[PDB]
Every structure is written in C-alpha cells, then in structure tokens.
Amino acid sequence: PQITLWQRPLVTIKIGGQLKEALLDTGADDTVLEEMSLPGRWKPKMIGGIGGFIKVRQYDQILIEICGHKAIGTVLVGPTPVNVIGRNLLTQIGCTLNF
Amino acid sequence: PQITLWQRPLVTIKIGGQLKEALLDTGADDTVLEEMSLPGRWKPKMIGGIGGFIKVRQYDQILIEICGHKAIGTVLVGPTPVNVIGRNLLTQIGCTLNF
Numbered sequence A, B: 001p002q003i004t005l006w007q008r009p010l011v012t013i014k015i016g017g018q019l020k021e022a023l024l025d026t027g028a029d030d031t032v033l034e035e036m037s038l039p040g041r042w043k044p045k046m047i048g049g050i051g052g053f054i055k056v057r058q059y060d061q062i063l064i065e066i067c068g069h070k071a072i073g074t075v076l077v078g079p080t081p082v083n084v085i086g087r088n089l090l091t092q093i094g095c096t097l098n099f
C-alpha cells in the first residue's frame, strides 16, 4: 500500500492476541504501546520527547502483524498517549518514505 | 527519493537562508523546529508529545526547503528534542509511506 499523509497514517495491528490501532511513525525509533501484558522477560527504559520522558517496559522479540505483514521486534509498553509503530518494526515490513 | 528506516530519516532543510538537519516524522501532525528567529507575528499553539502538552510559537506561511523541495506553510518553534518535519509540510512535498 501507498499511504497518504493528509491524515495520520493509522493502521490496525495484532499483538498478544489483541487488536490495537497504532500510528506509523518514522520519527519514533521504537514501537511504543499503551499498557498491556506481553509474554517473556522485560527491562525498564526511559523514552522522551516534547513534554518530557516516560518510563516503559522493553519486551524483545515480540511477534506483531501489521497490515498482513508478520514481523518480529522490540515493543515498549507504558503510559504513552499514542500507540506508535516505530522504525524498528517499519523496516521489517519494508516501509519507506517516498517523494 | 526513497528513504528507508534502518536509521533516522534525517534530511537537510533550509529556512531563513540557513541549512539545518531535520527529521522526517510521520507521527508529527505539525512541523516543530528548535528555537530560532522567524519573521512576522506568531500565535500560540499547544502540541502534545509523549511527556505531555507544551506551548510553542506558531508562524504561518513561512518559506522552507526540505531535501530540495520548496514548501510554504506553518512552522512551530519550541523545545523540541530535534527539528521535526511533520505531516503539514510532508504533504506539501508529496511524501507518502509505502510497503
């Protein structure tokens, strides 16, 4: 698909058996989602932007489906105001910026 | 161009006759640049980042070149972690996401 930026590029994802909406975000180094349970080990991390930093839990090697694409990656889980798909997983689906 | 996401999509921009590095950010609705001088009057704007909402200065109809492409639009100025080119100007340069 070619996705326009007239509007936020929102997509549906499946993770931990759950369907969530998330923003395809080239400015995000990492994928970050609102509070949820994920299997496996995790470690704490801090991520920041305008407004400051939040604490998240870093889960590695998590399977996600994004637009029919199956991908594997790191997911940060915490009190974020917006679910985003970051570069770590956009690369895995072959996503590029084009102009 | 076609820009992959293994590394941050940083490009060169020109504004006020100066070259700066900025991040192409499909998660940012709006372009926000580091503190700088711009002509004209500005208006208040609130923008929401991961740590919360902050006040920034809004300048409209500003000339800005992004990776060689000419744009004229709204440029926000404030304590952003990095210069980000948001959807308002990525649309102007004809940028899309593709996979």
Ligand SMILES: Nc1ccc(S(=O)(=O)N(Cc2ccccc2)[C@H]2CNC[C@@H]2N(Cc2ccccc2)S(=O)(=O)c2ccc(N)cc2)cc1
Residues within 6 Å of the ligand: A023, A025, A026, A027, A028, A029, A030, A031, A032, A047, A048, A049, A050, A080, A082, A084, A086, B023, B025, B026, B027, B028, B029, B030, B031, B032, B047, B048, B049, B050, B051, B080, B081, B082, B084, B086
């Ligand atoms: N590692 C890492 C660091 C930060 C984040 S993020 O701040 O949540 N995040 C997602 C987001 C926030 C708010 C609204 C919509 C999307 C970043 C990335 N896309 C926009 C946002 N930001 C730009 C950024 C932040 C840190 C490093 C490099 C760039 S931001 O400063 O919150 C921001 C928000 C809105 C606008 N107009 C401009 C900027 C995610 C992963």
Ligand SMILES: [Cl-]
Residues within 6 Å of the ligand: A094, B004
């Ligand atoms: Cl590639």
